[PDB]
Ligand binder design. Structure first.
Ligand SMILES: O=C1Cc2cc(Nc3ncnc(Cl)c3Cl)ccc2N1
Ligand SMILES: O=C1Cc2cc(Nc3ncnc(Cl)c3Cl)ccc2N1
Ligand SMILES: [Cl-]
Ligand SMILES: [Cl-]
Lengths: 124, 4, 124, 4
């Protein structure tokens, strides 16, 4: 086509989606990670995660308002990944890298799994 | 704005 | 913070949101523009438009499944802007620029209004 | 990935 493109549009959209999440506006699901609960938008979770994409395209699970993750999932690792979904920024630290990588593998977030593998390899 |  | 950032994350999210729109997955509103209907996600519309942001934060309108736009709104101009919301690409042409700018003014999409004003000024 |  002969379209023009606004460079900052995708980033501006994601910033506003994070503002709606922070104010709990039109969030339609709560993700339960052991004792912890995280409110989010199903569409953003699907857009970022192979696991959530599979869950919310399922004809029965698409209608659930609560999703319980596997008890081995670390709430902090999930929190870091949820923040990444809504911001593009990943708070990867020596103290959380193992939990973040395991959570990213479970959530099927391949780019995160890739940077975790590389950061771990450099420390070996 | 750019030509993509 | 000491976060790392994935450059293509926002664009990849928007691409997947457009794929969900194309397959009519988790769309939660229909925008009526005279004889034409457009299915979308309320969160994406709010993230792109000052008008939709105001509509869907209203305590009664937030729950509507159908929104009727002003009868002066051109369906093609709306279609072009909805495509822009989900892709960052604007199909701006001599034959549609007036309708696109008027629709962008109504929808409160300031960056679109700005490029339309500039493209019109160059042709004068 | 970059340092933002
Ligand atoms: O590493 C990742 C990130 C990811 C996201 C999704 N999401 C979607 N993919 C294709 N079409 C659609 Cl419609 C969506 Cl929502 C699926 C798989 C994966 N894997
Ligand atoms: O030209 C534009 C594009 C636009 C989007 C929105 N959206 C939001 N703004 C602030 N916080 C939130 Cl939560 C959202 Cl969703 C509001 C005004 C405008 N004007
Ligand atoms: Cl990822
Ligand atoms: Cl805009």
């Amino acid at each position: 086509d002969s379209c023009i493109q606004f460079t900052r549009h995708a980033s501006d959209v994601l910033l506003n989606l994070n503002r709606l999440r922070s104010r709990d506006i039109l969030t339609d699901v709560v993700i339960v990670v052991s004792r912890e609960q995280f409110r989010a938008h199903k569409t953003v979770l699907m857009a970022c995660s192979g696991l959530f994409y599979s869950i919310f395209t399922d004809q029965l699970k698409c209608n659930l308002s609560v999703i319980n993750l596997d008890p081995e999932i670390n709430p902090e690792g999930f929190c870091i990944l949820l923040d990444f979904m809504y911001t593009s920024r990943l708070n990867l630290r020596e103290g959380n890298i193992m939990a973040v990588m395991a959570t990213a593998m479970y959530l099927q977030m391949e780019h995160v799994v890739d940077t975790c593998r590389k950061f771990i390899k450099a420390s070996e | 704005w750019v030509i993509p």
